[PDB]
Amino acid sequence: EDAELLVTVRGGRLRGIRLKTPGGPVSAFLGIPFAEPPMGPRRFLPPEPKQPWSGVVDATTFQSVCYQYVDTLYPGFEGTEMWNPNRELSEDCLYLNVWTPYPRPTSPTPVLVWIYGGGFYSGASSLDVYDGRFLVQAERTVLVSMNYRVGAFGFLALPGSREAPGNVGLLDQRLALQWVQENVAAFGGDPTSVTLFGESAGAASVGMHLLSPPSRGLFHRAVLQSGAPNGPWATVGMGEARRRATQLAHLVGCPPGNDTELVACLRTRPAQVLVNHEWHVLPQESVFRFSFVPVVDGDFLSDTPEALINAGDFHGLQVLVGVVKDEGSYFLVYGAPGFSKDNESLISRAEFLAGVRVGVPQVSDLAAEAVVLHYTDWLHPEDPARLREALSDVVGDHNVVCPVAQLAGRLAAQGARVYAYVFEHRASTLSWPLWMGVPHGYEIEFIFGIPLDPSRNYTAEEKIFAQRLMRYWANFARTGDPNEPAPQWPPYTAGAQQYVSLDLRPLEVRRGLRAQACAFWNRFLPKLLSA
Amino acid sequence: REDAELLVTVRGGRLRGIRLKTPGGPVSAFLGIPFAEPPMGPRRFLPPEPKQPWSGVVDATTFQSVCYQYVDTLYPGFEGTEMWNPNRELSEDCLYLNVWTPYPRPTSPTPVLVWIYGGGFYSGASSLDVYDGRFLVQAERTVLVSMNYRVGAFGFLALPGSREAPGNVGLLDQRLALQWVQENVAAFGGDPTSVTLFGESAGAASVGMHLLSPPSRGLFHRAVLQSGAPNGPWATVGMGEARRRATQLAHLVGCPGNDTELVACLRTRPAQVLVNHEWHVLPQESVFRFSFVPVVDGDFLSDTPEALINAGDFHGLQVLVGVVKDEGSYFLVYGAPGFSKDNESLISRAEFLAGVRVGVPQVSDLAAEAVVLHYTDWLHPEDPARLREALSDVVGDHNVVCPVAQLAGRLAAQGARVYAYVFEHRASTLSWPLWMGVPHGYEIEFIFGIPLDPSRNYTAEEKIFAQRLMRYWANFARTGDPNEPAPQWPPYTAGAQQYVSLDLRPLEVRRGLRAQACAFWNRFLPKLLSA
């Protein structure tokens, strides 16, 4: 019997599994229950702590994926399937996973906590590309990842109601963070050194924990990859959340008014029925918009993330933030006219103008005209390749780059130490077409050291690159500074705006996260919308 | 006795001119030909009356008086400003024109160039040394005409709808002079079926207004617009604002209700008293705005120049347009905070933001914020040299470059053959400081061949350059094409947007009259001002 794989946590005993890596073994504890199953009458409600159990929980395999929409845009295509659920769907999904070195550390080891993305409508801690074994072996951290409710189950909100308060998927994350505080030392992890990191909606979640005081005491640093809580997609107002929740009820045959009866009827529906109507509550056809996201109702978030990012004192915070080179390209094939992964997507000017309304939904004609002004090359107004690149820039700037740049500049100007990057390496194995460049999400496999898997086809240079990135991230987790005793990564400041490029070449320091474009999204466009 | 070449009979009667010496040979000049009854006393503010015939011989042997006008005192005794100030006595008795012709007079009908001076509709005179027609006539063997027209209140005070002060009478002075050319120029050897108007700044705006006014349009065949356009935001005024300014002027000088009585009171005021109060009627502190300018009242202009340009059919028309390299710089020392000819004018960010409101007067705060967004380099938001250059661009783009580009693009798209230039040579004799670059107005001396004056010190290279520009201009007047019957000058079109640089080097073809900036001024900002 291997005592290294036996752990007692507060709720009882666990049995883990020893895994192989090219660098040697790691200990894994997969599918640890951290909440009571949010089933039946507990659907839409805040999570409750898992009650203690007798016997030994088998923690040798991933647990179920929280109920979510499954992408069918390109069936069987690797570029989309790698994000789809790779376990059975269930509402009984509140489990988390712990990877540690083997044998288990006997000195407090720094902890990384991963929060997956997926637009708050999808995602799972069990995805191959989030496999924690390489990071834990190479950099000797403890890695934790949790499942949290997505879609209606995590973020349907009738604000003011007790039956569907909203943001319970964020409380799922919070409960997992409290679980880490109480139990991670039993695995050799150090609860006084917890670094959150996440990508896209996971990065937005990280930012929301930064801005919510009950979460702030549960971790010490933050990494936001390709996402930010002030993204135009990351939160919804109370009025629009109520309208969406009420339209969902109508689409699945539930009354009307009274929130108690509405939620009671929703609780009688099979989970898949709610999933099947999720996208139809959005106000218009769009890309980069999701139906059920965090709601600003004064509780988890006392104000908009934007407002909270402006009012906060962030002295004592270190954050690592960044984007990929081509944030918008992946999102365009989900509704922008004329786009497809299977051709060059050389759109016409008419398609470009239509795409602006799809990629910047729910703004006035005047605001759309302002976008067209800034993103048109008026010496080549109709060039298809430039139009393709421009609309990719519109979607990536508006949704990712400029929200990240605003967060970075405000935090730095208000006392945080900020490191910024742009990830510029296109994986040799990438299945998406060349015109998409370095698409959203394709730095994750390098951060997690997936190239080290000998059963994959990465190059020798890409494995060295992966090791470099794992070292940056773990250096930051350990000290708040990614650098080592080699060209240096300088902090990002509101004035100098310095960031580094991450690719196969040594670090290159550059200035400005799309400064001209982001001045339009962050400084001028808000004035236009309110006047 | 008499030189037959210097005696000419026109409708009013007989004239006697002078034989002018030029470096290349003799020229005949008829200076100070009366073309209207003097607009004195009861005739102030009224449309021009045609000159009544006379017996005997009128000596047209020297320039007549400058129309009463403000005299610039910003830099007393400074060549760069004094060269534009009156060089003859001021008088309301000023409606005279000038004819230069080859000596001896042409045997066969000769193309006519008609010059309209600028000066913002508040100043200017056909007698300025820089408008000396003798070198053009001798070098290129055309007939050159220039006229004086009323400026300031005497030319453009308007109480719209009134009989006493209808407005635009300064434009009718120009028109009457063009009718005089049609009826009389053949007696000097000129060809009334080949008349090319050219003008600079307000003179270019005037040329464009004649293009857009049917009664003027039949009086000429081509047009040259140098650094000005009738759709400039300074070049016309609405009926209500013209009335407000005229009423304000009257109130400031003691007058008085019935437009008849108020104009009667204004007529009793000494001319200098009106001039002394002219700048006080502007609604705010500004640069590049002038109190009394053409009014859009449905008569001379049946609609705004913009609407007429957009609705016009311009087949059969050839036009030559252009700008100098630094249109804005000269205007900034007349009120932009921090600007001076006598220092480097390296302004702060605060002075830049203040300067935007001075250079873009009477727009909403949102409009001003849009200007700030477009002209700020957000990687160098506070760099003095960049801010100085940016404000120059603001004032130049808004008032000159973008109105000219809109005119050129719309005329080219609607059937006209357009040629475009940017003038990029800074004269070796220029007295303005180096930071002003190639300022507004400083192509004129080269177009008129002033470097060929023996008493001036231009370089030999500048004389060759002057000769080449005279050749372009006269080629265009003769044929509608500046090219020689050799780098070629391609027509300007709305798509390719080709223009040539004019400097000491051979012609260089470029694309875009500040296309990215002018898309903001010409396409987006009007939408913002509406909504």
Ligand SMILES: *[C@@H]1O[C@H](CO[C@@H]2O[C@@H](C)[C@@H](O)[C@@H](O)[C@@H]2O)[C@@H](O[C@@H]2O[C@H](CO)[C@@H](O)[C@H](O)[C@H]2NC(C)=O)[C@H](O)[C@H]1NC(C)=O
């Ligand atoms: C550059 O000069 C401007 C203009 O000031 C005038 O010209 C100067 C060269 C100098 O001779 C001054 O005495 C003149 O008044 C300066 O802007 C002016 O600054 C003064 C005093 O600070 C102020 O009273 C005026 O209102 C300012 N005028 C304007 C148009 O803003 C400017 O400070 C000089 N820049 C420097 C010093 O580099």
